[PDB]
Each structure stands twice: as C-alpha cells, then as structure tokens.
Amino acid sequence: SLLLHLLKSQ
Amino acid sequence: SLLLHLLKSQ
Amino acid sequence: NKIVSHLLVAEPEKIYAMPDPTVPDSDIKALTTLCDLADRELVVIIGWAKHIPGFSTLSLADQMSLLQSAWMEILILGVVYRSLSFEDELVYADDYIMDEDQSKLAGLLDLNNAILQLVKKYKSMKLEKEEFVTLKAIALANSDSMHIEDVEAVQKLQDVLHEALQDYEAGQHMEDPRRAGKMLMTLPLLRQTSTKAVQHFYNIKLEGKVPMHKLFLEMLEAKV
Amino acid sequence: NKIVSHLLVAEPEKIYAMPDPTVPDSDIKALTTLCDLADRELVVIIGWAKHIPGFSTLSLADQMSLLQSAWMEILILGVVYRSLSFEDELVYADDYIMDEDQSKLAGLLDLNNAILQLVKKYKSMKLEKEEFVTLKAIALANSDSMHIEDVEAVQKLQDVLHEALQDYEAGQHMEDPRRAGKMLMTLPLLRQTSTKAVQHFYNIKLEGKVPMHKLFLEMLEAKV
Q: Where in this protein does the record say Phosphoserine is found (chains A, B)?
C-alpha cells in the first residue's frame, strides 16, 4: 500500500 | 575438461 | 534531444548514507546502513518516475508493476554511475564508499564484484550522464513485469525512450553508428546484477538480523 | 546479409528427447529427460559455436568462458523458438512438449511460465528465424563472462554480430527503424530466465535425486 500511497501523493 | 575436449575435437 | 534534456533536469539530488558514528563497524551495521539508504532512495525513485513522459498516464497498477520489477536496477545504475571515476570502489553515497575489504566484511564481495563489472564496462564506453539517465528510464520501461494491464502503452513508453537514445547517439556519436545498440547490450548484466542483489537482500530479510524499513520490505516482497 | 545467411546454414539439426516409455511418469522422470536432452544439446551447441565468424580464433580459454556463461540462454532461446506457433506449451523437443499441468508435475511451473513470457514477447514481435539465429549468436558473444583474456576480440565479435542484426533489420524491416533495438531489448529477460533455470537445476543437482551426465554437470558447476 506504501508504493501506491507514494504514487498517489502530492 | 570435457568442454575443452569438445572444443579441441574434430 | 528533448527527452534527454528533460531526464537530466528531472535527475534527483543525491542523499547521504549517514552511517551511525556511535555503532561499532560490523556486517550488521553495513547492511543496516545500505538498506536504510535504499529505503530513502526508493522514495526518491517513485517521485522521479512521475517525470518520465507518459509514465503518470499509465494506470496506477501498471506504474506499480514497472517500479516493482525495476527498482533494484534503478538503484544499481545509480551506484554504478557514482562510481565511474573511482577504482575498485563503489560509491553508494558520498559518505559511504565501499572498497574490497569493506565488501568482504559486509558479506557483499560477490555482489559488489558484479556491480564493479558493470562499472568497468561503462568506464570503457565512457558512459555520459545523458546516456545514464536515458538508460535508467529504459530499464524502468523495459522491466518485464508479468502483470501489465496495458501492454501497448508500456511498449509505447519503451519506444519513446528508445527513440530518444537512438536520436541522442545519432547526433552526439556519429563516430560509432552502433553506440545506441552497445548501450542497450549492457542491460542484460544490469538485470543479472539486480536479480543477484534482490536474492541476497531477501535472504538477509529471512535471516532477521538486519532491521529493514517498510518501503524497502514492500519492494523486496513484490520481487520474490 | 551474409552473416545471417551463414548462421542459418550453421543451424544444427533438432534432436529427440526420447523419454523412457518403460518408466512411470513422475517429476524425476521429467527432470531426467530434460537434463539428458540438455546434455546432448550442449554437445551440439559447442559444435555450432565454431561456425560463428571469429569464435574459433579466440583462445580456447575465452571460447570456454563464453560458452560457460551463455549455454543456458542458448538452450532457452531454442525452446522459445520451437514454441512460437504453440499456445501455452513449451516444445523442448518434437517428442517432448510440456503444458501447464506437466510443468506443475515436474516442479517447473515458475520457470516455464517465465520461458512462456519470452515466447509471448517474440510472438508479438513476429520473430523470424533470421533474427533468432542472430540473437543466439549475440547472446553467446555478449554473455558477460568475468574471465575474458582478450576483451577487445570479444567486443569485436559482439560488434560483428550486432552489425549483422542492424543491417538485416535495415534491409528487411524499413517499416520499423527501431526493430534491431527492440530485439536487443529482449536480451534482459533471456538473461533473467537463464539465471532462474541455472539456479533451479543446480538445486536439483544438490538434492541428488536426478541423475545428470558429465557435460551438463560441468556447465552447471561453472556457472554457480
């Protein structure tokens, strides 16, 4: 979920 | 030695 | 070539390894330091990929798949590039340069020797920064994930970057009309070395002695 | 292109797997059959390499080094090529075609799935025999042995074959000026799949349940 979170981030 | 043998062969 | 110029400006700032000066040198310290650095570099890589033309228009699942497959190659290419003006040493970061003796102590002699083989090849080809950034992007696009949704969009991303390489080489290296192909022919060793690194660090993960952060663990689990 | 024509005429006759019809089907039977076939194919590969322009002028040590590094890629490329007109099956030989169920029974599901990924890519590119034989030779020359004596002669062999590919593609595929590069960009997955096969069969060797002949054992030992 962390990779996904960062791809979605900012 | 077998690879070497075959490389030298015929 | 504009894609090459864009990749150059998109190139992230370097980061520090910051090995803990209070901790005795050991294999566990060295491996903790490298895994911590990799975790932080992985955050930086995710942000960088969004600058590659077309990458962000891919679905999130495909963006994930490319990064899950290619992350270690991207990490390794960075170490290789930083190491080009050095001899028999690997510049993991400006404050973390590993020679042969340190590689032995960390239990990384075989892996770092293979990375040094990539360094040696690129040194001989006089790899330029333009070529480095373009090959990093190509390694991402050409990462061979088994899980791609839109194969035609990924092939187009590959094509776009491959075209930029060929174009760059046609303008900048007329003396060697095969230089683009020679650059592409270095990718097999990069893939081989990445697989080796992934397998080694996964074993390190299984052994349970080196603490690892969550992003690094996630990316390791996704690969094996 | 003459090098391509020469590689086509140098292409060896296929051989039969001849699984023992008296032996009950099992993982041990399947793996014995494949290892026996590979041993015999390895003899054929050694003879084939001598037909590649420049290979025999290399020192025996370098000839050995190239073959020691590249043999499994050459074996895999052959299976891939034979499998192109099939669906989800791998043609190890005309009398030995493995579907998914047989792959599971032999404990080869992951490996054969990766080989099928290479098949699928080449199917989509409509890989031709000319391109297959040239890439087999390129895989040999570009095998990244750590032990090369005459690096400049090996680079020239790489150059010669790379030139033949680029030339072939320039004459035969004007519709895709990047087709040569796309072919070279398939080599990373071939390298990855070979490494996987080598590691799997080495584990099989360590387990001691599958009898293996001397050439196959020699080539396996040299790689790990």
A: 1
